[PDB]
Structure 1
Amino acid sequence: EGVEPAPWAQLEAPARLLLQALQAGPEGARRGLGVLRALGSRGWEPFDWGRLLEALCREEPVVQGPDGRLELKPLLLRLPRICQRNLMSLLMAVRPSLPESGLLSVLQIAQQDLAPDPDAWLRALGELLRRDLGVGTSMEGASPLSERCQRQLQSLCRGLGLGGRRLKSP
């Protein structure tokens, strides 16, 4: 009645093994790095990551919300939320050696436009991944944090006598 297959069921063995690993609490991230050194070691040395970053966008349907709603979800919002945060943390660390075309398919999803109850972190890791590419300075006040954070923090550092340095250049 309640058997479900793991949403990476149908994947290439090594990425299956990566994503199986990152499941594993906050030591997910390092495990992941460990996972990649122990796949550089084995016969299929290369990681065609854009095989996986295609796979991470690929959609399927889910039925959640009311008891009657069809939706389309990509992979990224389907596999475990701890795998989401551990993934993005691993991508930061591996950013240089990714094709941009596939990478920006992720961040499109990530930015989480026009959704109620978004993945606070994922949004944030969007912003943090865009700053590290150098295509998404974006010309907003576009920082990882909440308005609530940024507001309270300006509101408190206002109670400290500003320093004579010049860091803003008008």
Structure 2
Amino acid sequence: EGVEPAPWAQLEAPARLLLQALQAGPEGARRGLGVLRALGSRGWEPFDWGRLLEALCREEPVVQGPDGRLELKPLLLRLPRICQRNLMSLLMAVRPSLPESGLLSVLQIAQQDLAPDPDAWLRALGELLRRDLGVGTSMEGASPLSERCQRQLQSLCRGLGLGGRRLKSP
């Protein structure tokens, strides 16, 4: 009646395992890494991240908020929050061996530009990914954290004897 088959039901079997795999709590991410060593081990030595990476954006429909509102989420804002956090973790662990073309498609979602009730965690994980590619300095206030954090931390670093290192370069 209210069965959903898991959103990765229809994928490449190995990925389907990966995404089932990260679902499993914070040690999710290593299970990630163990998964990957146990699939370089098997007959499909390459894992075409490229095939996975498109799929994470493929939009598909939901009716959420009021009784009736059609909206489209890509995979990333649809499959279970903990595979989100544990992907990005793992893509930091494998950042080099990807195409940028796919990644940036993901990150654009991750940046979460104009949504209400955002994925703080994924956004932050975006900023930490863009810094590492070398395409999202952004000239901005675009560092991983909250305004509230950066402010309450400036507030306290003041009440301490500043050092004779020179770290800002005017």
How does the TM-score come out when normalised to structure 1? Answer: 0.99
Residue 149 of structure 1 and its aligned partner are, at CA, apart by: 0.2
Deviation per residue, 1:19-63 (Å, 9 max, x gap)? 110000001000000000000000011010010110000010001
In structure 2, how many angstroms separate the alpha carbons of the residues matched to 1:111 and 1:141?
Answer: 13
Partner of 2:51: 51
Partner of 1:15: 15
Partner of 1:163: 163
The alignment of Structure 1 onto Structure 2 pairs a total of residues equal to 170
Residue 68 of structure 1 and its aligned partner are, at CA, apart by: 0.7
Residue 3 of structure 1 and its aligned partner are, at CA, apart by: 1.0
Q: Helix, strand or coil for the counterpart of 1:91? A: helix
Q: Helix, strand or coil for the counterpart of 1:25? A: coil
In structure 2, how many angstroms separate the alpha carbons of the residues matched to 1:41 and 1:92?
Answer: 21
Q: Helix, strand or coil for the counterpart of 1:138? A: coil
Deviation per residue, 1:62-112 (Å, 9 max, x gap)? 010111100010000000001100011001110000001011000010000
Structure 1 unpaired stretches of 5+: none
Residue 141 of structure 1 and its aligned partner are, at CA, apart by: 2.0
Deviation per residue, 1:105-140 (Å, 9 max, x gap)? 000100000000001100100100000000111100
Structure 2 unpaired stretches of 5+: none
1:141-152 equivalences in 2 (<5 Å): 141-152=141-152
In structure 2, how many angstroms separate the alpha carbons of the residues matched to 1:61 and 1:4?
Answer: 13
Residue 142 of structure 1 and its aligned partner are, at CA, apart by: 1.0
Q: Helix, strand or coil for the counterpart of 1:87? A: helix
In structure 2, how many angstroms separate the alpha carbons of the residues matched to 1:124 and 1:144?
Answer: 4
In structure 1, how many angstroms separate the alpha carbons of the residues matched to 2:70 and 2:98?
Answer: 33
Q: Helix, strand or coil for the counterpart of 1:26? A: coil
Q: CA RMSD in A?
A: 0.5
1:18-29 equivalences in 2 (<5 Å): 18-29=18-29
In structure 2, how many angstroms separate the alpha carbons of the residues matched to 1:168 and 1:141?
Answer: 16
